[PDB]
Amino acid sequence: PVPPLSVRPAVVMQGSARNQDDLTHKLADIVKINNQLRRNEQNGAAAHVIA
Amino acid sequence: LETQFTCPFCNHEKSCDVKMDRARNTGVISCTVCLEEFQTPITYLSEPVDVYSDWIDACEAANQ
Amino acid sequence: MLGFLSARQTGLEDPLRLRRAESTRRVLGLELNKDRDVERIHGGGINTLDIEPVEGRYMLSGGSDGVIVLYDLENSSRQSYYTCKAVCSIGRDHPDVHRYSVETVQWYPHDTGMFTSSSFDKTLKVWDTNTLQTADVFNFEETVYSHHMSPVSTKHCLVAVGTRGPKVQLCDLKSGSCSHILQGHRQEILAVSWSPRYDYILATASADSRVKLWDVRRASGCLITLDQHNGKKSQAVESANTAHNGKVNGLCFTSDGLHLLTVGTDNRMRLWNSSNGENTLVNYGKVCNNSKKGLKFTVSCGCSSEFVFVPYGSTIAVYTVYSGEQITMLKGHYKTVDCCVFQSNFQELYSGSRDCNILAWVPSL
C-alpha cells in the first residue's frame, strides 16, 4: 500500500523546488527495484541474481 | 571466525564441515561436495580455522 | 561353448550369436584383475575416466587434484602381467593445469588428436593431445559439473556444459561461440549427455529433479520432460513432471540410443523411452547414491544383453538394463566409486574412486 499524498506531503520550498517526503523517496526506491526485479524474473536471470 | 570453509579441491563455498574429536585430539575436515577428507592433530586451543589451516598446509606441501 | 564354435563352423548360428553370447559371458565373469595393474599418479580421487572411442587404446583420467593423466591400456610388454603405463600428464607443473578438480574429461570423437576437460575452476579446456597444450579455453561464470561432446556429430561440434547455473551452455568448438544457452531448468545441471542416435538431441539432468531432452537446433525449449508416473499425478507444468524424488545426478543413453538411464539422489535408477520420455517402469531396486555432483556411469556394448555399471557406494553394481535384474557387485574399492568406463572391445571395466586408485576389471578365463 502506497499511502496518499497527505501522509507524505511534497512541501514547497522558498523557490519552486518541490521537496519530496522520505516516504516518497523510499517508494521511489521500492518501485525502481521492483520494476528492475520484475524484468529480471520475467526474463532469464541467475538464481543468485534474482535472490 | 567462520566454521564452514571453501574447499581447496572443488572450490565450493562453505562446503567443508569440521569435526573436533577432542577426546582423541583429532580434527577431521570433510567437504560435502567432493567428499575430500583430511585429519589433523588438534589441541584444546585448536579451532576449525586451525584444522582448515592444517588442511591447506598439507595440500600445499603434498603438491610440491 | 564348443557347441557355439561348432554352430559357427557349421553355419547353424550366425557368428553374431557367438560374438554377443561370449561378450555377455565375459561381462558376467567380470572380476578383480589377476594379472593387470594401472599406474598410480593422481594425488586425489579420480572423478572421471574416458577411453577413446576409436581404437580403445588410451584412457584419460581427471583427478580431484586437478591433474589429467593419459594412460596406455595396451600390454606392449611380453608378460601376462602388466601395468597400464601413463603416457602423458597435465601435472601440477604444467602451465595450463586445472586449479581445482577435473570433473569430466572426454576424448574428441572421430579423432584421438584432441580431448577436453572441464573443472570446478570454471573452465572447459580443449587440449591438443600431441603437443599437450591448451588449444582453447572456455570460461564460465559458475563451476562446471559436467560436459559432453556428441559421439555422433559429423556436422556440429558442440560441447554441452552443465554448471551450477540453471542454464545448459553449448560451446561451439567451431568458431568459438559459448553464448548459446538452454532455458528451462531451475537448479544446478548435474549431468548432460548427447543422444548417440540423434545428432541434435541432448538430455540434461539437474538438481530440480527434472530431466529434459532438447533439440538444440530448436527455438522452443526442451522437447520432453521425463515424468516418473507418465501422467498418473498430472499437474500444470510448474513443479510436477519430475524424473526423480531428488537430484538427478547421472544420465546415460543405452548403446542404441533408444532408451535413457537416469540415476538420482532418491536412491533410484530409471529407464525412459528416449522418443517420448515415458517411464518403462523397470525396477532396478535401490541404487545407493548420495553424490552431490554428477555421477558417471556407463552401459555395455556389443553383448547379447545390455548391462549398466553404476557406482554403488564403494562398489560397481552391474544391472541388466531392460529387466533390471542385479548381476553382481564388483567389490575392490576402498572409498566411494566416482566413475566407471567400459572397454567394449574386450568387455573390460576401469573404475576410478576417491581412494586414488584406478582398478581394472577383466573377464575371468
Ligand SMILES: [Zn+2]
Ligand atoms: Zn570439496
